[PDB]
Amino acid sequence: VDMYIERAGDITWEKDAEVTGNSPRLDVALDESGDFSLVE
Amino acid sequence: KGXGKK
């Protein structure tokens, strides 16, 4: 009832895409609730 | 992440 979906695009790789973000390597734990946390 | 992780 409550939620509905609306199409927003094709799923395609874009040649000229903006490139950004870094590439951190992180020790994490995943708990039973599906939450990631940073490990000491 | 808006505050959060989600």
């Binding site: 939620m3 509905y4 927003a8 799923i11 590439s23 992180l26 734990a29 609730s33 599906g34 | 989600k6």
Partner: protein, 154 residues
């Protein structure tokens, strides 16, 4: 409508029309993250999509059929987040994933920050394949956001 592609997940219960997340339609199945829908049925026009599979710990859910997305990051190449932010056109962002190292193995992660309602946006490889969904992550000593590349099992 059931055409393959990326979709906004909207609700009219709160103020106005609000985007709570995003998902992928492929092979007749709709894929999003669990925390977007909490497993609720979804409307697609005058049709209905009922949940078929989900798992809170993976933070994933599929509608109308089993999870269909099985591509995986190759561990080496740049990827593209097809971000669909609330109220904004879909935009491709290319990035080199980092890595979440866990007790049960390593998963790709993308260090890109978007509004919460962007949850479920697909992450793609250079072949256009969905290698996972954006929006289950952590916040680092910086205060910045890093999302796992969350992929299911087919």
């Amino acid at each position: 409508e059931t055409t393959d592609g990326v979709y906004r997940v909207m609700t009219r219960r709160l103020l106005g029309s609000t985007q709570v997340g995003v998902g992928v339609m492929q092979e007749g199945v709709f894929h999003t993250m669990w925390h977007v829908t909490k497993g609720a049925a979804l409307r697609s026009g005058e049709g209905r999509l009922d949940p078929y599979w989900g798992d809170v710990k993976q933070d994933l859910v599929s509608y109308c059929g089993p999870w269909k997305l099985d591509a995986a990051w190759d561990g080496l190449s740049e990827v593209q987040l097809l971000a669909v932010p609330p109220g904004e056109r879909a935009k491709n962002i290319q990035t080199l994933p980092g890595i979440f190292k866990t007790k049960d193995g390593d998963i790709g992660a993308v260090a890109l920050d978007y509004p919460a309602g962007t949850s479920g946006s697909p992450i793609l490889d250079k072949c256009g394949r969905v290698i996972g969904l954006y929006g289950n992550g952590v916040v680092i000593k910086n205060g910045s956001y890093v999302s796992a590349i969350t992929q299911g099992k087919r």
